[PDB]
Design a protein around this ligand. Structure first.
Ligand SMILES: *[C@@H]1O[C@H](CO)[C@@H](O)[C@H](O)[C@H]1NC(C)=O
Lengths: 388, 37
């Protein structure tokens, strides 16, 4: 102990943004964390408090008109499905309108930023709040407490509400892949993140809008450059590569690692039986270059409580973006960066060394380099090595 | 059965209208495909 990353309120608050069981509190790959009654039937509801950057639902419709394979297309009308045949055409987007024909979805950010009811301080927050402020009506035309999930398109600046809260459909008894088998009503679909595509899409439960500025300080929105996540054990920060249950793979790029923190088979997921992960899962990882120059990806389910300095590493989570820098649409109109939380000055922040961990024969070294806290494990002293 | 299976994977209520605090009540202008709900 004497974990520098737990040493004071501000550091603790900083490191807490990485704990997806603390604030997000639901599934990531599939989020169905809540149950809501509509008209006497209980339904599963996306519930997570953090936006999932880059998450989209990839569809398996036939590759031909009228099918667009794009979840952001309107849900299909009965007449459209009659014309297409199987499977269902269209996408997940809510197509409802007011009596004058104004669409609820997609809804332009340009209207949300000048509306007195919308209190959020960022564009993402305003989309999330719009989603929170939308509820299903039941068969008596009464408001319920059931809320559809949203996708923010930060490229087009459009807020989408999804009528389809399903995120994963599979099994050849239920859905077809590219129209095969042709008798099936549903096409298959699954959540994806991609090394190149749809980074500008952000998927979330409507509950991201419940306290719509909260995600800015409580969610790991951006990748963290320059550090590997680790856990504090035997007096020093062990990065995931030192942990037994860690999954380590060679990767050709950092982006592939970011995609693996979301797609790997242990990511927090609520998909069947109705599991509630509570955000527990293998959601954390980092790209690093190992000592022989190979690019690797380490994935773990251990929530990080310290960091190991490594200027060529980048730490990702299942929830966050590939981007390492705060984008403009989450900066308040009016929360410290990693650079700020991790800042030090050389003459105020002396080197410290912890006790030798005689099992590994290594000790913690914490120092200030380049105005930023460094945290590594170094060789023990000669005498200490006697004890190893 | 098929209803329990769909519910377990997030199949949503058969809803024709939503209320939004900015727009008020908003409804499908044509019947939505039944299977969607
Ligand atoms: C993550 O949050 C959960 C629940 O809030 C908590 O029990 C756990 O201690 C946290 N883990 C940390 C800070 O490493």
């Amino acid at each position: 102990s004497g974990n520098p990353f737990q040493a004071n309120v501000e550091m603790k608050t900083f490191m807490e943004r990485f704990n997806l069981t603390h604030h997000h509190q639901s599934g990531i790959y599939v989020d169905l964390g809540q149950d809501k009654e509509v008209d006497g039937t209980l339904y599963r509801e996306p519930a997570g408090l953090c936006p999932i950057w880059g998450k989209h639902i990839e569809l398996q419709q036939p590759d031909r008109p009228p099918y667009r394979n794009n979840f952001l297309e309107d849900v299909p009308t009965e007449k459209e499905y009659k014309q297409s045949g199987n499977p269902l055409p269209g996408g997940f987007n809510l197509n409802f309108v007011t009596p004058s024909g104004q669409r609820i979805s997609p809804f332009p950010m340009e209207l949300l930023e000048k509306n007195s009811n919308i209190k959020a301080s960022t564009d993402l927050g305003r989309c999330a709040e719009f989603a929170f402020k939308t509820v299903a009506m039941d068969k008596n035309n009464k408001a319920t407490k059931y809320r559809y999930p949203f996708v923010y398109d930060s490229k087009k600046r459009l807020c989408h509400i999804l009528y389809v809260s399903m995120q994963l459909m599979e099994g050849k008894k239920y859905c077809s892949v590219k129209g095969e088998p042709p008798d099936l009503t549903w096409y298959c679909f699954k959540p994806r993140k991609s090394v190149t595509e749809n980074h500008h899409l952000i998927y979330g439960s409507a509950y991201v809008g419940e306290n719509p500025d909260a995600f800015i300080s409580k969610c790991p929105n951006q990748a963290l450059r320059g550090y590997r996540f680790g856990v504090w054990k035997k007096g020093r920060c062990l990065d995931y590569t030192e942990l037994t249950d860690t999954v380590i793979e060679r990767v050709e790029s950092k982006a592939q690692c970011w995609v693996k923190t979301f797609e790997n088979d242990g990511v927090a997921s609520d998909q069947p039986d109705q599991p509630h992960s509570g955000g527990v899962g293998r959601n954390y990882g980092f790209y690093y270059v190992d000592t022989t120059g190979e690019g690797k990806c380490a994935l773990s389910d251990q929530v990080p409580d310290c960091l190991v300095s490594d200027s060529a590493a980048v730490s990702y989570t299942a929830a966050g973006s590939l981007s390492e820098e705060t984008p403009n649409f989450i900066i308040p109109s009016n929360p410290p960066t990693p650079e700020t939380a991790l800042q030090c000055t050389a003459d105020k922040f002396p080197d410290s060394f912890g006790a030798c961990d005689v099992q590994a024969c290594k000790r913690q070294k914490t120092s200030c380099v380049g105005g930023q806290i460094q945290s590594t494990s170094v060789d023990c002293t000669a005498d200490e090595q006697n004890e190893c | 059965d098929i209803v329990q299976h769909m519910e377990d994977i997030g199949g949503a209520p058969p809803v024709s209208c939503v209320t939004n605090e900015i727009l008020g009540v908003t409804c499908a202008p044509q019947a939505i495909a039944k299977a969607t709900x």
